[PDB]
Structure formats: structure tokens, C-alpha cells
Structure 1
Amino acid sequence: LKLPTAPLQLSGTSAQIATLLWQVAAKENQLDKVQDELYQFIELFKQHSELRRLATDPFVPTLVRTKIISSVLKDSGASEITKKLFEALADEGALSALLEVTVNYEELMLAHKKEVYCTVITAEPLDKLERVELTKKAEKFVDAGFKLVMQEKIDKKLLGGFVIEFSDRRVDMSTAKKVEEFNNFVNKLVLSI
């Protein structure tokens, strides 16, 4: 009908569930409420073997699976969205799809909190000024006014400077790449002259 448009478009049938789960929770302003209930269910599948039996065992009947999930969620203050969600997955036997639904629910929340997780690997630990200087140039790399969070790593094989690891791309603006980008450039040119 008239659902809010998702922050970024995703894969098939397990990200399609989470995109619809996101669009419903944004129409109802429960985007962090059902996100936490998803995380609560991942731990709840970890505590009990009788709850992951309703997601892997092929001999648990459909009637037992849909009655038990509705029974333990008739109460307990869960969302109207996640109560309808879990009885929908328990009818179809797709309760094992929860663990991949929620990681697509994460990156929809990440592209709505306006956020990018990264990893900065440097040579020495940073200043109160080095942290502001590379952050001021790392707004050029994220494709919005996104909030880069941070992450600080240490390696001495870099000769000062930094690299970024954006979990899908990297920027090697260290000096150690700059010296072999120098050397392979100056060796390329003297064999031209």
C-alpha cells in the first residue's frame, strides 16, 4: 500500500522479509523495538534445544510448531509486528531464516541510523588532532553525511599514515603504499627514457 521506502535495496527472500519487516516497523515507529526483539530471539535459540527443534527438525508437525510459537508469544510484551512475524515463519517452517533475516535487518538499521562501520589501521596510536584530521578527510569516502564510527588498529609495517577498511572497500593512503607507488612509477619512467 503506502509503506516507507527502505534505506537500501537488498537480496532475495530473506532480505525481502527483513525489508518488509523494516517497512512495517518504520510505519509503526518501532525500528529499535523489533530490532532488539530479533536479537533477543537469537539468544533464545541459543539457550534452548527445544526451540531450535522447531526450526531444524522435519518431523515436528506444522500444528505443533505454530501452536508453540503462538503460546510463548501470547504474553511477554513483544511487538505486534514480531508476534505476527514469528507465527508467519512458523507456518511456513522458515524459522531458521530468522538468523539471516536479522543480519539484513541490521544493515537496514545501519543505513538508517546514517552510519558506516570501518577499521583504521595506523602506525602509532593517534592524537586528539590526528583523529579529527583523518575524520575530516574520511567524509569524502562515505557517500552521504554518514557517521563513520571509528576503529583503531596498530601495525608498524606501515610507515605512518593510515588505511581504512570499510568492509567493502579500502583506501590505502598510507606512506608505505606511497613509496612503492613512487618506486614503480620512477622505475616505469626511466625505462621509457
Structure 2
Amino acid sequence: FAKLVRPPVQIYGIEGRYATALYSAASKQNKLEQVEKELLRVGQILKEPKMAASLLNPYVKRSVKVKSLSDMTAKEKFSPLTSNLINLLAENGRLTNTPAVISAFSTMMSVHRGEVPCTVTTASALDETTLTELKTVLKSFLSKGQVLKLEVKIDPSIMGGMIVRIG
């Protein structure tokens, strides 16, 4: 079939098994970004019921639900393979599930190269970091905000509890 292509984040697949399709698909043809933005759009373009809530209503025939929810509307400019994957998640009911694919996705060309370490408070904040260099400190300085006792606490950040924890 194809061969594996996965933008930085990348993901685990699974409700992103699609994501990963487009982590190879979008990626390939490199409308990576076209769709990258599409998705974003879609998100709220999505979010309101209609011909969408349609699905919920079991009794609405998926067959034509696709031809309504996506016929006139989700092809409003969401199409390339994008309507087709719409129409796939559509079939495959992964529509209510779609946000998460975006989530998953969206850490993708930017956030694709995110920022991770699990770090007190509003922790990391997916950005970008280059592991050879420190990037850490910098960030911290920037702010003298967050909440750190309520938000992540002196127990992590510096063991308030630990002294308790030995006994």
C-alpha cells in the first residue's frame, strides 16, 4: 500500500489511525498544511449540530447523512481528500471522535515539533525545544506566573511533602 510518513507528532494512532493516514497523506502531496489548516477550520465548522446531530439520530440513514452533512456543507471548502476522509469518519462514525484526531493531528507542522516535559503548573506548553540545548530555564523566566501549590506544587517541583514522606 503506501509507506510510513508521520509529521513530528506523529502520534500513536488510534482515533488517529486516521490522523496517521493523513500523517502520511497530507504529508505526502504536502497539502500537509492545506489540510492542517482545514482541520482547524473544520473544528468549529463542525461543532454545531445540524446534519451532524443527524447521525445521533440513528434513524437518519448514514447514507444520506453523508449526503447532507458533507454534501452541501462539508465540502464548503473541505474536500481534497478531506471531504473524503470526512466522508470516511462519517461512515466510520468517527465524527464524534474527530476533535481528538485534530488534537492529535495538530500537534503537526509547528506543534508537530512540540514541547513536552512535564513540568510543574501549566507545564510544557507545546512549542519546540532542541534537546541538545537547554530551553527550559528561558521559559521560566519569561513568566513569573502559573500557580505552583494549586497548580503544580512544591511537592513535585521541590517536595513539600517529602520531608513528610520519609516520616
Matched residue pairs, number? 146
CA shift in 2, pair 1:88/1:74, >3 Å:
same
1:95-174 mapped onto 2 (5 Å cutoff): 95-110=95-110, 112=112, 114-116=113-115, 143=131, 150=139, 152-154=143-145, 172=157
1:155–1:22: structure 2 CA closer, same or farther, 3 Å change rule?
closer
CA drift of 1:92 comes to 2.7
Structure 2 gaps, min length 5? 122-128
What's the counterpart of residue 35 of structure 1? 36
Quote how far apart the aligned CAs of 1:102 are: 0.7
Q: Which residue in 1 is equivalent to 2:58?
A: 58
Match of 1:19 in 2: 20
8 Å contact kept, 2:120–2:148: no
Give the TM-score, by structure 1 length: 0.56
Letter in 1 for 2:23: W
Cα separation, 2, equivalents of 1:60 and 1:42 = 23
1:22 touches 1:105 (CA, 8 Å); kept in 2? Answer: yes
Question: What TM-score do the two structures reach when normalised by structure 2?
Answer: 0.64
Structure ranking higher in helix proportion: 1
RMSD: 3.9
Residue type at the aligned position of 1:29: N
Work out the percentage of aligned pairs sharing the same amino acid.
22
Which runs of 5 or more residues in structure 1 are unaligned? 122-138, 159-164, 166-170, 189-193
Q: For residue 124 of structure 2, what is the aligned residue in structure 1? A: none
